Design an enzyme around this catalytic site. Structure first.
Site: not given
Lengths: 8, 353
Positions: B26-27, B32, B34, B49, B145
């Site tokens: 999904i990422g 890294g 995920v 992750k 952030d």
């Protein structure tokens, strides 16, 4: 209340 | 692998606990990968992750360990938490992979931005944001952030914050999401290099709330020079007492600026964009925005006060607001140094913990 929703 | 099993995720391999099934990407970093997964034990979806090359260089190793230590300092429901951490390797010698299990949400704030929203759902989200932010600050963690992509929500209107004290990135948000750059939401003192404090994230939240109302980014700067322009053209040129605090050369440039006059908050956020008794709220909301979207950090509203604000105060729950962090982040870690192998151990022990 705290029992609200939101749809995507 | 007896207690583990392999699964091919794109050009990568995931060796995870058997309890995690239906793995799917999904990422993706960069830093890294995920995967969304189903936790059979919990009957609940999780985000897995896998850190990419945490031992590649001395720098990566410090980040891998540091990320673990950060999520150790947190025990709040409005902040992402480590449900589980593991490695598929049996000994320190062959230890090389680290997996992080977190709660899997449905969305991030970006998909909320475009929604209409009312005062109860809006003020509630902001309340959770302030709750998670306070918890971080208590743990000695200032986010800086904060942006709509690293703030995640579920369909039941629950909120959690990602990527506290991570480089950009590094963190989880960059690898997935409808992504957004952090530039738009950074406070003046950050971009003007004046140093910052707790209420630097109050500015961020301000920019987020403004976007929720206007359904559009408040300060879309092409760069940091343009960024500063966007800010002052709408909020006006800050008082001399502020600018005196600036560095020599930058101070002149900012004093060199054309003196813009700030639009009034009723002008920036007309009641048109707002929704009767529920018009007292539009006043309450707009007011709050005028305290958060302040340029001078000294004249900006605190996290505590923001919790006490009439637009937010309706949700006040001391259990949600006063929940102490399990641990305070020792900043004397950032300046610590170790070899890759030494780092590898500190991480390893943390995993086996």
């Amino acid at each position: 209340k705290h029992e609200m929703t939101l749809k995507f | 692998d007896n207690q583990f099993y392999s699964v091919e995720v794109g050009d990568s391999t995931f060796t995870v606990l058997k309890r995690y099934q239906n793995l799917k990407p999904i990422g993706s970093g960069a830093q890294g990968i995920v995967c969304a997964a189903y936790d059979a034990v919990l009957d609940r979806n999780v985000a897995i992750k896998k850190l990419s090359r945490p031992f590649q260089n001395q720098t990566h190793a410090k980040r891998a360990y540091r990320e673990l230590v950060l999520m150790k300092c947190v025990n709040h429901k409005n902040i992402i938490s480590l449900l589980n951490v593991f490695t598929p390797q049996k000994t320190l010698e062959e230890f090389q992979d680290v997996y992080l299990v977190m709660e899997l949400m449905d969305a991030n704030l970006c998909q909320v931005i475009q929604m209409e929203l009312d005062h109860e759902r809006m003020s509630y989200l902001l309340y959770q944001m302030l709750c998670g932010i306070k918890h971080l600050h208590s743990a000695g963690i200032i986010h800086r952030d904060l942006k709509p992509s690293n703030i995640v929500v579920k369909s039941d209107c629950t909120l959690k914050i990602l990527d506290f004290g991570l480089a950009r990135t590094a963190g989880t948000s960059f690898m997935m999401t409808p992504y957004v750059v952090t530039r738009y939401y950074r406070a003046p003192e950050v971009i003007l290099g004046m140093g910052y404090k707790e209420n630097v994230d109050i500015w961020s939240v301000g920019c987020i709330m403004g976007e929720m109302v206007r359904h559009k980014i408040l300060f879309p700067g092409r760069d940091y020079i343009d960024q500063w322009n966007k800010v002052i053209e709408q909020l006006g040129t800050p008082c001399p007492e502020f600018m005196k605090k600036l560095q020599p050369t930058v101070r002149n440039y900012v004093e060199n600026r054309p003196k813009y006059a700030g639009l009034t908050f009723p002008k920036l956020f007309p009641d048109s964009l707002f929704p009767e008794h529920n018009k007292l709220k539009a006043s309450q909301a707009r007011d709050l925005l005028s305290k958060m979207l302040v340029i001078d950090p000294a004249k900006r509203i605190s996290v505590d006060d923001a919790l006490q604000h009439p637009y937010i105060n309706v949700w006040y729950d001391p259990a949600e607001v006063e929940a102490p962090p399990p641990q305070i982040y020792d900043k004397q870690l950032d300046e610590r140094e170790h070899t890759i192998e030494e780092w590898k151990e500190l991480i390893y022990k943390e995993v086996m913990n």
